Amino acid sequence: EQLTKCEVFRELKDLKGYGGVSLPEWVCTTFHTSGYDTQAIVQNNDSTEYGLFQINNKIWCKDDQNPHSSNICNISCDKFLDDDLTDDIMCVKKILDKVGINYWLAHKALCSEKLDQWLCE
Numbered sequence: 001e002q003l004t005k006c007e008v009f010r011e012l013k014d015l016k017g018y019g020g021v022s023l024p025e026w027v028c029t030t031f032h033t034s035g036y037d038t039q040a041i042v043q044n045n046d047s048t049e050y051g052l053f054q055i056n057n058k059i060w061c062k063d064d065q066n067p068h069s070s071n072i073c074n075i076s077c078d079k080f081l082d083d084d085l086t087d088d089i090m091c092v093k094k095i096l097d098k099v100g101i102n103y104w105l106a107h108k109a110l111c112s113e114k115l116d117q118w119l120c121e
């Protein structure tokens with residue numbers, strides 16, 4: 001699913017404020033992470049990143065490329081490619097708990113200013 005900006009804003013409600021990250025910050029960060037494509041996959045021969053949040057199969061979820069992933073989120077990476085972001089968000093919270101927002105390199109570069117582009121009524 002190719003989400004719109006304010007569909008992301010709505011669907012990410014449960015991340016608002018968690019770990020100090022605002023919802024406009026998440027709307028910006030996801031745009032510059034996956035372009036709002038819930039089916040985005042970025043890969044090389046070592047690792048694969050999945051979905052709206054580009055969660056990786058090195059340590060966060062398990063897949064066929066890396067079946068021995070630590071799988072901290074205790075989930076198949078395939079669950080990050082569907083339209084339901086509930087499990088996505090649960091995993092994002094674990095990422096924030098352990099390594100914080102700089103898992104998403106777009107946040108510092110692109111989403112620490114001009115947050116008024118990322119607002120929804």
Ligand SMILES: Oc1cc(O)c2c(c1)O[C@H](c1cc(O)c(O)c(O)c1)[C@H](O)C2
Nearest residue numbers: 004005006007009010011013119120121
């Ligand atoms: O969390 C809420 C929940 C949703 O039901 C609404 C969401 C945000 O914003 C949308 C929206 C669309 C636009 O085209 C805008 O320009 C805008 O500001 C907001 C629209 O109101 C539906």
